[PDB]
Amino acid sequence: AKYTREDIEKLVKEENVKYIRLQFTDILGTIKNVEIPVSQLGKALDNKVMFDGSSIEGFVRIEESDMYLYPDLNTFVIFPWTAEKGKVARFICDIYNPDGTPFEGDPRNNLKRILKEMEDLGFSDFNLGPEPEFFLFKLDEKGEPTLELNDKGGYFDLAPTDLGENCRRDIVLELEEMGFEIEASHHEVAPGQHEIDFKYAGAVRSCDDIQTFKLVVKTIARKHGLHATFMPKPLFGVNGSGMHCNLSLFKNGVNAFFDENADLQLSETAKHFIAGIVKHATSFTAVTNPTVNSYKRLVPGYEAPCYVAWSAQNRSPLIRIPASRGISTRVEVRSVDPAANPYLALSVLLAAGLDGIKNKLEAPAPIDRNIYVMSKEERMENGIVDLPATLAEALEEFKSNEVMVKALGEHLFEHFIEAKEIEWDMFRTQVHPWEREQYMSQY
Amino acid sequence: AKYTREDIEKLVKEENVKYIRLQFTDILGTIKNVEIPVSQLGKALDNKVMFDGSSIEGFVRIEESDMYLYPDLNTFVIFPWTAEKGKVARFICDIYNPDGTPFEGDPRNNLKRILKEMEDLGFSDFNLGPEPEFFLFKLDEKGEPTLELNDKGGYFDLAPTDLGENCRRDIVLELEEMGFEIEASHHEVAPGQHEIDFKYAGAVRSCDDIQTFKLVVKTIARKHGLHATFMPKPLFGVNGSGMHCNLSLFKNGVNAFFDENADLQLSETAKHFIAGIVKHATSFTAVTNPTVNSYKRLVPGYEAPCYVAWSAQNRSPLIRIPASRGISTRVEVRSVDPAANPYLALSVLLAAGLDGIKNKLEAPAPIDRNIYVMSKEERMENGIVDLPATLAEALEEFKSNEVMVKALGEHLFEHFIEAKEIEWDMFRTQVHPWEREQYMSQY
Amino acid sequence: KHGLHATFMPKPLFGVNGSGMHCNLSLFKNGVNAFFDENADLQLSETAKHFIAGIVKHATSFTAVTNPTVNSYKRLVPGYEAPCYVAWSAQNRSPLIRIPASRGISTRVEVRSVDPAANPYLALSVLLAAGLDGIKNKLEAPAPIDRNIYVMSKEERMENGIVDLPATLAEALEEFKSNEVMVKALGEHLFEHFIEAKEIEWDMFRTQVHPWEREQYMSQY
Numbered sequence A, B: 001a002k003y004t005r006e007d008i009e010k011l012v013k014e015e016n017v018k019y020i021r022l023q024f025t026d027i028l029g030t031i032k033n034v035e036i037p038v039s040q041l042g043k044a045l046d047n048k049v050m051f052d053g054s055s056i057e058g059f060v061r062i063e064e065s066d067m068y069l070y071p072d073l074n075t076f077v078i079f080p081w082t083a084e085k086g087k088v089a090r091f092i093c094d095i096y097n098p099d100g101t102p103f104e105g106d107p108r109n110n111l112k113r114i115l116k117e118m119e120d121l122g123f124s125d126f127n128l129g130p131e132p133e134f135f136l137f138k139l140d141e142k143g144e145p146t147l148e149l150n151d152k153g154g155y156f157d158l159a160p161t162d163l164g165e166n167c168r169r170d171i172v173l174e175l176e177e178m179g180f181e182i183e184a185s186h187h188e189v190a191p192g193q194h195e196i197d198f199k200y201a202g203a204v205r206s207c208d209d210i211q212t213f214k215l216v217v218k219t220i221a222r223k224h225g226l227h228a229t230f231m232p233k234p235l236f237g238v239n240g241s242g243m244h245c246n247l248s249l250f251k252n253g254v255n256a257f258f259d260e261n262a263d264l265q266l267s268e269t270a271k272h273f274i275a276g277i278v279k280h281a282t283s284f285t286a287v288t289n290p291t292v293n294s295y296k297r298l299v300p301g302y303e304a305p306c307y308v309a310w311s312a313q314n315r316s317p318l319i320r321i322p323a324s325r326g327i328s329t330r331v332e333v334r335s336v337d338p339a340a341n342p343y344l345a346l347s348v349l350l351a352a353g354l355d356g357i358k359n360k361l362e363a364p365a366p367i368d369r370n371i372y373v374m375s376k377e378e379r380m381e382n383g384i385v386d387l388p389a390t391l392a393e394a395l396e397e398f399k400s401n402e403v404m405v406k407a408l409g410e411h412l413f414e415h416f417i418e419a420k421e422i423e424w425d426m427f428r429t430q431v432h433p434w435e436r437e438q439y440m441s442q443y
Numbered sequence C: 001k002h003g004l005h006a007t008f009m010p011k012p013l014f015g016v017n018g019s020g021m022h023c024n025l026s027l028f029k030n031g032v033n034a035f036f037d038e039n040a041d042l043q044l045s046e047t048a049k050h051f052i053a054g055i056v057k058h059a060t061s062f063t064a065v066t067n068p069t070v071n072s073y074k075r076l077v078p079g080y081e082a083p084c085y086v087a088w089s090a091q092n093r094s095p096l097i098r099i100p101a102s103r104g105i106s107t108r109v110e111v112r113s114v115d116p117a118a119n120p121y122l123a124l125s126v127l128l129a130a131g132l133d134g135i136k137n138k139l140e141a142p143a144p145i146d147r148n149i150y151v152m153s154k155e156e157r158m159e160n161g162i163v164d165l166p167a168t169l170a171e172a173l174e175e176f177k178s179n180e181v182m183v184k185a186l187g188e189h190l191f192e193h194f195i196e197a198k199e200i201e202w203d204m205f206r207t208q209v210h211p212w213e214r215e216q217y218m219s220q221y
């Protein structure tokens, strides 16, 4: 462990914490929370706090449901801002049923499920290195976001300077001085676009850190008259945002993807694991790419993938293997975007990985040069399948895949489809202005 | 023939026509023309006038290819308003290849081609009674259309009073002067929505009239400071515009759907015709509903059909059989909208119809009870398939159907699919504000 | 009168189609069309094919006269049915010379590079000249095009007889003077002044700092 009961109780009093956030996540990755006064800390810690866990369903919510909040002492942090009438702290939580057993519909409990699944396969840890990219827009006079970007910088160029706003900096600085362990940051292709990358960790810790990240970001940028967004494709004709996930499996504390005397120094396991991501992509896209707008980013020309394939050096491969070996031997899935619920994504990915490891699946040819030109037909004759063009399509594929459905859980699954189909249904019946411009005088 | 080149030449003079409009239609429904001074009437009549035939292929045009214009003297018309300097007149023309053969790309030639099929099966005529519905919005100071309607009238309401505007009256009064045979007009179920019904007529002559119609409407509308539109679904949340087509088959000038001592007075010739529409509807939709915006009209809640089935009394059936019998015995198709290209719509329809007659297709049970209650499973488990949700689907479907492909023509089919696909691809990559509204703060 | 402004400016709007003024030409010898030869390939006479050949020869030279203004070279850009290469065909996307279908009396060569800003008396002078210079010297026309101008590369178009038009007024001018047959087609007075005015027009243009240049560099540098 990291923190013990009394360690926490000492921390709270000394640091003058006065407001605890009991933090959790809903199906739509949205970050929920029940918040108590410091004085309630005890009730909390004894796992006695109750709330309406149907909040987990998001808007598909129908009936109320009393559930318990189980804090996780090791996820205890004190927020650096705060300090008004006292400081704030949080606890990430696992949602239990009123009968003491963990609530399945909880995404955090769901990953812990597939993780245990991994251990039965005899593995030690599942590592994630995420690279979450975001846009910073400006807030208008009313304090309302606009389409104005925070700068005009590009890829990796030093911008903005150290005199003023410099969100990215102040974010990494806050994160670092707040327990985080960041690797690096940089400006991204599109103007106003940014990326912070954290050191790898185990799935749960990595997903918890992604949810805390987003928040800390959203927060910092608001503080500088800016609006942060993790919306995949906010603007047509510019780069969208994505969250490539760097994945690695350990066995007995040792990377199991690596192998010196091998080809590419990638272990047989590696090759199999990859194999799995290859055959489940089209059927797990709906989860890694959960919003309607997610598929507007999945268009050719913007670094984002569009076909199921893996390379070591290509324009925009679904999967790619970075240079480093040894401990850094890893598989990177580049489909995933920020909108995705980290817990659901990691669980649907781990699950597809293990599946290919379990059933010893044969990884396909690594793609050399050109998936862009090589038209549909040819691309097909090479076993290169296209991702779903729309959320609708993505759903029809997810619903067809037995193992992917099992990765979610009857409850999580049922409600996730429920949400997405209504989400799509709305967007489909909507008459966008584009239609009016194209058709109103034409016809 | 209604005129002889002498009555034409005579009339042109006594009436002082100074400008001839040789009008034809492109594959995209659009109404085109080449204008020549009266001093060239002779060159036109002798089928000598040339132009860029590839204009028929619309925006997917690549190379330029000359072609002739053969004016149909029976389609002669002297526009009423036209003055100052002299009058104007028109000729609907057929497109011929530089080498005397008819251009296979011309949608008007196509109809005539399918119509011939009909003749081979001994039927004399194929009749159409179209129900063209359209919206009327206001022009701003700049002469630009607005989202504001010219009235707040309702279904069959006495729209605009006989003082001033009354566009629907003037349209009809002008149409009647031009030797039109109008059955009756009326206000439709939404503010600014109008309808004018024509007397039944033969497929070609009626199809020609539809085109002329939208012209006259367009013209007079502006004349009143308004903007006519046949866009199937101008605005989300109100009724869409459709163009039902009352179809009937004649075997030597004697309605072949009528059958006195018969079940519902519908002959077996009729019953088959229904069947053909039923099986093919899903496949001919991309043609009768050519626009992206077309599928926003094909949504539950209005009178527009969302699934295949015929009935004599229903909420919104794809096929409906009106009361009148004898010479008035007809099948009504209610999916077609005013954006569809008349000549193509009839070819694809005649095509599915005849396909059902010659193959003695068995028509399904007519629906009666609320299909609105039966969901997919229920509807599915019966002869009730859903129509295509998006242009994309309507296209795949269409291009799958061998008999609906032979209905169009290789030339016409090649480009129609090309245009439509790009139309779709442009819409798919577009980022609409709705998306920014939904996601820019949620994520 | 109708409250509008007509322009014959070649390319008023970036990214939209430009205005051209194709020219259908024909030579008559004894009241008959010297271009029509019903019996030879494409019913085109040896007279006709020669004429075409000369246009192919002097195209890159006369473009400064048939497309005089600076804006004219903005229309000479790929994508809009305006020719960019010296070539001919009876049927292609954007040929410099097109041969229409009509035969007999209607047998003609259409030159598609000419824009409406050209001077009609100079554009025909130069065009007739390149054409007379072909018949006079019996010049051989190359092969027409099948279907690959914008498709291949400049180095590829090059590995054939297909050269590009000048990409600028300044470039087109340097080509105009290089040619003696074309210069003579105007003559001392017309030639000297045209050059003097066009060169100026061009120096004027090239010293100008545009909003585009400020949009890209003002901040980036």
Ligand SMILES: NC(=O)CC[C@H](N)C(=O)O
Residues within 6 Å of the ligand: A133, A188, A239, A240, A241, A242, A302, A303, A304, A334
């Ligand atoms: N790898 C990169 O930095 C490119 C990110 C790009 N926005 C994407 O969607 O993948």
Ligand SMILES: [Mg+2]
Residues within 6 Å of the ligand: A062
């Ligand atoms: Mg429920």
Ligand SMILES: [Mg+2]
Residues within 6 Å of the ligand: A131, A133, A195
């Ligand atoms: Mg990146």
Ligand SMILES: [Mg+2]
Residues within 6 Å of the ligand: A131, A244
């Ligand atoms: Mg990356």
Ligand SMILES: [Mg+2]
Residues within 6 Å of the ligand: B057, B062
């Ligand atoms: Mg073509």
Ligand SMILES: [Mg+2]
Residues within 6 Å of the ligand: B131, B133, B195
């Ligand atoms: Mg109606």
Ligand SMILES: [Mg+2]
Residues within 6 Å of the ligand: B131, B244, B334
């Ligand atoms: Mg009706």
Ligand SMILES: [Mg+2]
Residues within 6 Å of the ligand: C022, C110
């Ligand atoms: Mg021309």
